[PDB]
Design an enzyme around this catalytic site. Structure first.
Site, mmCIF file in Angstrom:
data_model
loop_
_atom_site.group_PDB
_atom_site.id
_atom_site.type_symbol
_atom_site.label_atom_id
_atom_site.label_comp_id
_atom_site.label_asym_id
_atom_site.label_seq_id
_atom_site.Cartn_x
_atom_site.Cartn_y
_atom_site.Cartn_z
ATOM 1 N N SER A 163 -6.225 -5.598 3.098
ATOM 2 C CA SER A 163 -5.862 -6.923 3.611
ATOM 3 C C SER A 163 -6.520 -7.372 4.913
ATOM 4 O O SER A 163 -6.522 -8.569 5.224
ATOM 5 C CB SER A 163 -4.344 -7.045 3.752
ATOM 6 O OG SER A 163 -3.739 -7.214 2.483
ATOM 7 N N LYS A 181 -8.934 -10.228 4.627
ATOM 8 C CA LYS A 181 -8.494 -11.613 4.509
ATOM 9 C C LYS A 181 -8.982 -12.603 5.566
ATOM 10 O O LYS A 181 -9.431 -13.697 5.230
ATOM 11 C CB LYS A 181 -6.969 -11.641 4.399
ATOM 12 C CG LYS A 181 -6.468 -10.982 3.115
ATOM 13 C CD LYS A 181 -4.955 -10.887 3.080
ATOM 14 C CE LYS A 181 -4.472 -10.307 1.758
ATOM 15 N NZ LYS A 181 -2.994 -10.172 1.744
ATOM 16 N N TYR A 212 -11.080 -10.042 -5.501
ATOM 17 C CA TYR A 212 -10.208 -9.778 -4.365
ATOM 18 C C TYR A 212 -9.995 -8.273 -4.189
ATOM 19 O O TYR A 212 -9.976 -7.763 -3.067
ATOM 20 C CB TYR A 212 -8.865 -10.480 -4.567
ATOM 21 C CG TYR A 212 -7.795 -10.050 -3.588
ATOM 22 C CD1 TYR A 212 -7.871 -10.401 -2.244
ATOM 23 C CD2 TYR A 212 -6.721 -9.266 -4.004
ATOM 24 C CE1 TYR A 212 -6.905 -9.978 -1.335
ATOM 25 C CE2 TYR A 212 -5.751 -8.837 -3.107
ATOM 26 C CZ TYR A 212 -5.851 -9.192 -1.775
ATOM 27 O OH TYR A 212 -4.916 -8.733 -0.879
ATOM 28 N N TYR A 246 3.814 -10.946 10.017
ATOM 29 C CA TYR A 246 5.065 -11.627 9.694
ATOM 30 C C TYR A 246 6.309 -10.769 9.482
ATOM 31 O O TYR A 246 7.390 -11.109 9.967
ATOM 32 C CB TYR A 246 4.871 -12.496 8.446
ATOM 33 C CG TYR A 246 5.853 -13.641 8.337
ATOM 34 C CD1 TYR A 246 5.668 -14.812 9.078
ATOM 35 C CD2 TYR A 246 6.965 -13.560 7.497
ATOM 36 C CE1 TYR A 246 6.559 -15.870 8.987
ATOM 37 C CE2 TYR A 246 7.868 -14.619 7.398
ATOM 38 C CZ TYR A 246 7.657 -15.769 8.144
ATOM 39 O OH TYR A 246 8.535 -16.823 8.051
ATOM 40 N N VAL A 248 -3.106 -1.526 3.814
ATOM 41 C CA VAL A 248 -2.402 -0.352 3.292
ATOM 42 C C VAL A 248 -3.170 0.972 3.321
ATOM 43 O O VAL A 248 -2.599 2.024 3.044
ATOM 44 C CB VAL A 248 -1.877 -0.592 1.845
ATOM 45 C CG1 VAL A 248 -0.781 -1.657 1.861
ATOM 46 C CG2 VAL A 248 -3.013 -1.022 0.927
#
Lengths: 435, 440
Positions: B64, B67, B191, B243, B261
């Site tokens: 991630s 991103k 992705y 978040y 991760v």
């Protein structure tokens, strides 16, 4: 020559003032009947200036723009643990959901919403403070940051107190979960008077500047709030100050802000400016329409943003010159981690003690030491390498305006290692700010 | 001598490394079986330094933390309007609610969550780009910011492609609302490959620094991204990057970040540092346990935070000296609005052209000009007032920009205006601009 900033503001006011969409707050006659043909703006800078235009000297009740200041006061009077036990940091809109109290964090979301603002007022002076001590405190914090004694508009107060069932509802709910120890009426009355404190566009700008500088009053240089407190306040204003505005405020505007239903918008951009805008008519979300638009224009026309990387950095090093066996390293500016890191790079570059094959481009760039530093803003750090047997290093801190403990510890450590290399180090610190 | 920052990091690694809580990503054996006994950290500064410690050179899949970079590439490639029509700015956690797409805009909440990340990959090169071109673009943007050609760990890719039902679900739902045009399988594959890109702690630090400097590579000084794109990326990282972390990240830490991760955490603090941390084991919300803890310590120990006022400000004025009829005004640093405002104050203060009774304290302070300056920040702006302070008009002002590193268009427009006005006063202005940075 006249300053061009006030002229830009004057022009901005004329341009945006050509229209007047929305309507004044209708909840109370004093605000509903208010004259809508008003528009003012003020910018308070760390340089101690106040650039204004329009009706920037007309008083109006601060309303919710008061929330970040009583929050700072509460943090100062009670400490973070006491305040955080009652007020959360969860970004949120005004709509009340009992689950925030019954579950989740078990406390009102944040200091920007009414529930959190009520809990903040309950916290002001102390555990057993009286209502008068708490209101005086609310009025005091705002007056201290504004630089003058402010007054409450009692007429506005009385009008609002007649239509406060919603706030009374929140206060009662807070009491049932233990967030408020005093009566709903007592806390709502304090919160309503707090919101009725009269301020001008100029007042808000200066008050905002006090937060933007990290707690230092721009007109006196006196520290009004601990930097840790000022940072928490601006952080909360960022996450929830404009929660229900069109688009996404941080991304779009990048200027921490908060509006009040009387037409005043507060803005606080760290390290650069305090903002105050006044325009009665509110858009549909309840924020000053022109006040909001003015902030979006400031952000765009001046390229201002919480994210822009305008830091001291390498400029912390004014220059590095050598006289045979001794080197003179002069520092300057407001030194913190960024500046102290650069200073250490300079010291290390004196040679008093990634793989080039992998990044050939990084080597070529590093070759033109001066050009790379210019395109990067490394100030005069590159001069250290140019200077580089050195037997003495004079460290001059005359041009340094101030420095935080982190900077002190890093430089102190830098000095120790220089000596540990067999280099004599004399620190010219006239106002002794290093110790 | 040795730079103390690397020693600080080494100590931090040794300390935090005394324990190793949590567990590796259990969804795939490649990550589930990874050596948990690894911990590295690296800081990339604007100066062009790379301070690191521990296993800062061990490769791992960025996951991630990819991103923010593909998001930047999409903005660069398609422009803001095109991207904003498919990717929102609404802060949100990973939990997916169909309602988010049922809005008038029909777009996932933001680029940090999977759904938004899938939408971003779909936008990568252009309307008609192929799957291969899109993957190449994702690998390229990360490579350009890292400063070296990166590679995908296909073993991780194949492994994850075998258990991608959730992302395939998001992809299908997005197609359902017109957010994705190509097949769910094609977008998920790109992705997943994007997430399988290999980087080290050092790579992340440098990549993060490119964002922190507003789009400038710290090692070459070359602009890799428009500042406006960099700002949007760091803003989105701030709002949703962490978040679901304990407490509230912006307030408690103040360092825009994103975890992966595989154990890597990316940090980017505007104007000061790019951060890369690596530690395999994850906490219960799925972020690197020690990686996150290291960011909290960096923020506290170095008192770093997005909200500090570490600005050039008045220091933009190096000094203001006078010799009879002429004044020498030397500027310096990275000049934008903040510095330009100070420069204009210095120019105005030369006197070539609130109520004191209300704020007596403000007057007293304005009396000891030098003291007020040091306490506030104004650098040498105050020397202008001292220069104006009993005999003879100022006839010439030498404006020297040799020490100025660079200036943006705003500072460039403000200073040009200030100069025109000085001239309108009949003052002669000669601008010493060796690298001519003032024009345009």
């Amino acid at each position: 020559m006249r300053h061009p900033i006030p002229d830009y503001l004057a022009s901005l006011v004329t341009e945006l003032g050509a229209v007047n969409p929305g309507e004044t707050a209708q909840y109370i006659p004093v605000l509903a009947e208010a004259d809508p043909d008003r528009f003012g703006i003020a910018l308070a800078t760390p340089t101690g200036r106040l650039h204004c235009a329009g009706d920037a000297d007309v008083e109006f009740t601060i309303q919710s723009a008061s929330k970040p200041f009583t929050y700072a006061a509460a943090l100062v009077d009670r400490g973070f643990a006491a305040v955080d036990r009652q007020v959360g940091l969860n970004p949120s809109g005004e709509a009340f959901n009992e689950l925030s109290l019954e579950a989740e964090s078990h406390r009102p979301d944040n200091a920007m919403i009414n529930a959190g603002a009520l809990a903040v007022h309950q916290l002001l002076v102390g555990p057993e403070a009286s209502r008068k001590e708490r209101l005086d405190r609310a009025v005091e914090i705002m007056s201290l940051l504004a630089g003058r004694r402010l007054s409450v508009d009692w007429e506005t107060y009385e009008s609002e107190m007649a239509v406060s069932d919603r706030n009374l509802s929140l206060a009662h709910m807070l009491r049932s979960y233990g967030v408020l120890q005093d009566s709903a009426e007592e806390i709502v009355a304090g919160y309503v008077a707090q919101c009725a404190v009269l301020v001008t566009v100029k007042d808000l700008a200066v008050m905002g500047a006090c937060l933007a500088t990290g707690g230092i009053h721009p007109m006196t240089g006196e520290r009004m709030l601990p930097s840790i407190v000022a940072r928490r306040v601006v952080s909360v204003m960022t996450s929830s100050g404009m929660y229900d505005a069109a688009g996404q405020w941080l991304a779009d505007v990048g200027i921490p802000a908060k509006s009040g239903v009387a037409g005043g918008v507060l803005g606080a951009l760290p390290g650069r400016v305090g903002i105050g805008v006044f325009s009665p008519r509110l858009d549909e979300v309840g924020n000053s329409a022109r006040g909001v638009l003015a902030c979006r224009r400031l952000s765009e026309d001046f390229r201002l943003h919480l994210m822009d990387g305008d830091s001291l950095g390498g400029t912390a090093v004014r220059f590095v010159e050598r006289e045979g066996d001794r080197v003179f390293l002069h520092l300057q500016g407001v030194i913190r981690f960024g500046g102290a890191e650069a200073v250490l790079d300079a010291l290390t570059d004196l040679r008093t003690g990634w793989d080039a094959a992998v990044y050939p481009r990084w080597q070529e760039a590093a070759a033109d030491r001066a050009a790379l530093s210019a395109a990067t803003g490394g100030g005069a750090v590159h001069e250290a390498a140019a200077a580089a047997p050195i037997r003495t290093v004079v460290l001059n801190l005359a041009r340094v305006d101030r420095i935080d403990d982190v900077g002190r510890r890093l430089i102190a450590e830098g000095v120790r290692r220089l000596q540990a290399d067999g280099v004599r180090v004399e620190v010219e610190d006239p106002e002794r700010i290093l110790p």
